[PDB]
Amino acid sequence: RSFDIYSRLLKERVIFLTGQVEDHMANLIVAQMLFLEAENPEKDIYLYINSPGGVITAGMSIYDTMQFIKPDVSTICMGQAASMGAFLLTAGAKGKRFCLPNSRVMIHQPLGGYQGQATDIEIHAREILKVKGRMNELMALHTGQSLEQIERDTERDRFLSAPEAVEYGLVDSILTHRN
Amino acid sequence: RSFDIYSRLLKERVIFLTGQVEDHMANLIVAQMLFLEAENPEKDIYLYINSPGGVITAGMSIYDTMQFIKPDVSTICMGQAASMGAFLLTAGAKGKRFCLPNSRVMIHQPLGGYQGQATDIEIHAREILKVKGRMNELMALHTGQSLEQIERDTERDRFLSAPEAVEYGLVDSILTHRN
Amino acid sequence: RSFDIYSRLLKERVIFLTGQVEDHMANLIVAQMLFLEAENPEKDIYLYINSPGGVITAGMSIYDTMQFIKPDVSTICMGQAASMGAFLLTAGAKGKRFCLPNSRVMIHQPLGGYQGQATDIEIHAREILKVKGRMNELMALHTGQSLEQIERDTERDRFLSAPEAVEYGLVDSILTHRN
Amino acid sequence: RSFDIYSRLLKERVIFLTGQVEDHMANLIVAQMLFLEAENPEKDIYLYINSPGGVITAGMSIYDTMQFIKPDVSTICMGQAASMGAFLLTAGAKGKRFCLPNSRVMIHQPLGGYQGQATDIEIHAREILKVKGRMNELMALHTGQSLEQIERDTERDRFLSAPEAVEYGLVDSILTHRN
Amino acid sequence: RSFDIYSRLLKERVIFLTGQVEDHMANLIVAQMLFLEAENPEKDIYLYINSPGGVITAGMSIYDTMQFIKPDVSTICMGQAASMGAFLLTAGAKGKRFCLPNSRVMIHQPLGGYQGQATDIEIHAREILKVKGRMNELMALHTGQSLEQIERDTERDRFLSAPEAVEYGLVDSILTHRN
């Protein structure tokens, strides 16, 4: 009886990624993902996305589980998919990634901040550059775009309307009307 | 019986949109729409609106779900419908957008801001202005008012009574007594 | 059923170690493991990790549990698993420790701090060294390096990507894709 | 018999695929497979492969036919399997793909070339890419690697030894001695 | 025996049209058909096609022959069927035109060239124009589309995947497995 709306939508194999991406909320998407694999490792899974990004590693826990699990993971971004939100979005299974008409996307680069000794600082700094780069490769690969474009387009906050994210390979098309 | 009051009204295809428009409440509304559509994609969906407005990207996520789903979304304004609230009110299926007798409407332009490097400041400013356009075009369409007209009317706050709102074209008519 | 997704997943014998490691969530993990050993001391027990590190005594309460129960413990890594979370990872039963593709490890030495009289400062100072003392050996032993290598490698913060993770013998291998 | 050693070995349901891959020698493979199918639809077919690759269409006419026919087509790699030779190698029935101890494998992306007007250059440029894309998907399937693991690794000539090719999902096992 | 494999297959009414289309390999195809019509003028005849195209007149001796003989020539494309190749594929008996999964099709208008006195060039180009006219007509026919539609689609090389091919009307369906 729509006792719990989301639990109910989990029976249509739909999952919601909303807001701040961080460990726990991420973990709750993983746990859903896995649960759906088992309930049926053959049917498609739905990941709706309206988020501004967040802690990356947490963000990556979702990503790897989207690949790891048997079923294809379709993604539909509504409202906004930014930074890490844009990533998991374009990480949907090819041909199954969407954008509602006025949703909007944003890309940019790994953000961070360490504090301590010079020695330690080079350590964590070298690390963020590696991640900055991997994230760029994994993005080059899901978008079909060169490492040059990503690198340039992601050095600074960059926005895309629904048409443009399609035109960029980020999502495959625009769902305008449930026909 | 009436355990959970809202659940039961969701069974009468009634969803409430109350207060500030932000990611998590806007998301619980979209899910209500998806659930209602899944249960019966033909009967209209009734959306009551009493909100002061809020986060645009969160609003649009509601906007696109409304226009997406096959079922028509009848929007009803009680109390007030400001900014993103008015926006969503004027987006109910043409013909089924209402205002209870004393609800109130106000409209304006997007509010926001950035902080950072001039370069980054310019990217974010053309982006909110890119949205201002798209938002103004969309207003024009739903109300029938000309783009160029909605602009003049949105540089500043503009209040609308139920009557003037019927005339501005934001709503179709006034609901006074259940007949 | 699917009231608590973590509850349901606990059925497939899957336990999650998530976020900061401390006395109460650690214990919650200790109980889930104990609970499984009762429901089948023969079937494997899965333990997902995405921890940024935590407290030591509490970390051990777990460790010592993974070693005390009869069921084996396959640790899988998603997102990250620093400090105590890298330990517990490489503490999984041999050949059943894994790192998803973009997950990341990071190992270092026991952080702490004390306050008060000199006599006691030495007392707790001696004690911390003994803990690092004992921590390093166990790392060597679980990984395979020499109490000296491990030693080196953990004086400062140190990262290892998924691959570099196996090579150092922290994890048996990169848990690729549900095949 | 021995009058014609290959004809004699076809009787034992064995087909050799040797050297450059082009329409004609490929047609002959397709014709030996079609022919074996017609003689006995249930018995395996052994496709020995020692090729440096060649023309992709010519090969695809061999991959589709391989999959299409009812019999299981086991693939044995001797000497070398590169490019289209490695694709076809990995395309044999699951479990029934092998390598001899010193077979060496090499995978890489598609090669092509067009000459003409920019407009036409466009079509051809984008078709070669559509092809690289379908090709990378199929290598994902038959290997278990993720679409992104293959685009990554085939981005450039990658050499795999017998055990690495087993360890990678290209072939199922290494045949050393007949027993 | 299996001395000649294309012969054994001929007995199964299978004819291969491989690579370049020209008078002599065309004439061989044509005679193979007349032979199968005399054998048994009722049974279908299968024609596999893996060809980049070729000389038009040589192609029409094949086309006119397929239509002329009582037997229904089913057509099945492996690898690729470009230009006159694609023309012939779609010229197969109705409902009896196929494409294996990853075979590809390419369509386009007639190519040619003359050398001489203006008058002769006039008489010759006029002619290549009559042929384009008839080539397009016959394609509209066999595929279902309309004259206007083809000429549009065919002015420049155009690629079609097995699916797109069926969607377009060149082939009736995609053969995937022997059921």
From Swiss-Prot, chains A, B, C, D, E:
Entry similarity comment: Belongs to the peptidase S14 family.
Enzyme class: hydrolase
HAMAP family the UniProt entry points to: ClpP (MF_00444)
PANTHER family from the UniProt entry: ATP-DEPENDENT CLP PROTEASE PROTEOLYTIC SUBUNIT
CDD domains membership: S14_ClpP_2
The protein's assembly and partners: Fourteen ClpP subunits assemble into 2 heptameric rings which stack back to back to give a disk-like structure with a central cavity, resembling the structure of eukaryotic proteasomes. Component of the ClpAP and ClpXP complexes.
Superkingdom of the source species: Bacteria
Active-site residues (renumbered): 83, 108
Role according to the record: Cleaves peptides in various proteins in a process that requires ATP hydrolysis. Has a chymotrypsin-like activity. Plays a major role in the degradation of misfolded proteins.
Stretches assigned to coiled coil: none
InterPro entries for this protein: ClpP, ClpP/crotonase-like_dom_sf, ClpP/TepA, ClpP_His_AS, ClpP_Ser_AS
One GO BP: protein quality control for misfolded or incompletely synthesized proteins
Reactions the enzyme catalyzes: Hydrolysis of proteins to small peptides in the presence of ATP and magnesium. alpha-casein is the usual test substrate. In the absence of ATP, only oligopeptides shorter than five residues are hydrolyzed (such as succinyl-Leu-Tyr-|-NHMec, and Leu-Tyr-Leu-|-Tyr-Trp, in which cleavage of the -Tyr-|-Leu- and -Tyr-|-Trp bonds also occurs)
Keywords: Cytoplasm, Hydrolase, Protease, Serine protease, Zymogen
EC number: 3.4.21.92
Descriptive protein name: ATP-dependent Clp protease proteolytic subunit
An example Gene Ontology molecular-function term: serine-type endopeptidase activity
Gene Ontology cellular-component terms listed: cytoplasm; endopeptidase Clp complex
Organism of this sequence: Escherichia coli O157:H7
